[PDB]
């Protein structure tokens, strides 16, 4: 029901449920929607979407981020050249998908994180072991 | 076509030659040298109770806008040289002044211990 905060390494290797495709299993926990944070290490642009290779220090995964659509004057030309690039930090909330034998995240939401003193990323690094200990590593229900 | 993940290593682990040739890594330190002509950066860190150097090659992160004297986190691949020091070939070089360094280091430790405890 939530966007599950997980290591990219677990996303990459959780077994898929045969009974309910698109649902993945971590210790008997049914995982679909995830929340990842990491460094952009690759950018590929297509007509309808961006592919952002995201590295969270445990693994690297492609996140497919669908393109959208004063407004063109104040914002758009500024949006134009603040685009996500290699080296940026991004947060991606979406679903785990398999496509052409590769695992991917299909984004429901994605944004560049301003993290100038590594505050958000340190907090994430510190929080994850706790969510695993309290929830994911505990018997499902 | 994705690279391997930038695994966290403490800089004195990189310094002491504990990261195998060709590994992909994140490390950190204070930027103490930038020479654009030779595309070289040196990151420095103190640890009980010596100074430790991490050699970085900046070719892929040029044009590099240096904050010499500031803390950085580098993401890249470690490469043996013939035969000076091992160098990190940066793919990302990020200024993080004033990150809470000891908190970073604790987060790295907790992450490793969790992985080990699993």
Residue numbers in the entry:
A (entry chain A): 24 to 92, 112 to 183
B (entry chain D): 2 to 119
Copy the relevant paper text:
Like the scCST, the hCST (Ctc1, hStn1 and hTen1) complex is predicted to contain multiple OB-folds and it binds telomeric overhangs with high affinity and some specificity. To further elucidate the role of hCST at the telomeres, we solved the structures of hTen1 in complex with the N-terminal domain of hStn1 (hStn1N), and the C-terminal domain of hStn1 (hStn1C) alone. These structures reveal that hStn1-Ten1 is a RPA-like complex and a structural homologue of Schizosaccharomyces pombe Stn1Ten1 (spStn1Ten1) and Candida tropicalis Stn1Ten1 (ctStn1Ten1).
A search in the PDB database using the Dali server shows that the structure of the hStn1N-Ten1 complex is strikingly similar to the S. pombe and C. tropicalis Stn1-Ten1 telomeric complexes with an RMSD of 2.1 Å and 2.9 Å respectively, indicating significant structural conservation of these telomeric complexes between humans and spStn1Ten1 and ctStn1Ten1. We observed that the hStn1-Ten1 complex has striking structural similarities to both spStn1-Ten1 and ctStn1-Ten1. Many of the conserved residues making contacts between hStn1N and hTen1 are located on the C-terminal helices and the β-barrels of these proteins. To determine the role of hStn1-Ten1 complex assembly in telomere function we designed single and double mutants of conserved residues required for hStn1-Ten1 heterodimerization. Functional assays of hStn1 mutants defective for hTen1 binding show telomere signal-free ends, longer and fragile telomeres, phenotypes associated with telomere length deregulation and a dysfunctional scCST complex. DNA binding assays reveal that hStn1 shows a robust ssDNA binding activity while hTen1 binds ssDNA at a non-appreciable level (≥15 µM). Interestingly, the hStn1-Ten1 complex exhibited non-specific ssDNA binding activity but with an affinity lower than that observed for hStn1 alone. The OB fold of RPA32 (hStn1 homologue) is a DNA binding domain that is involved in the 30 nucleotide binding mode of RPA, and helps the complex to achieve its 0.1 nM binding affinity for ssDNA while RPA14 (hTen1 homologue) is not involved in high-affinity DNA binding. It's possible then that hTen1 carries out primarily a structural role in hCST assembly thus enhancing Ctc1 and hStn1 DNA binding via promoting the proper assembly of the trimeric CST complex.
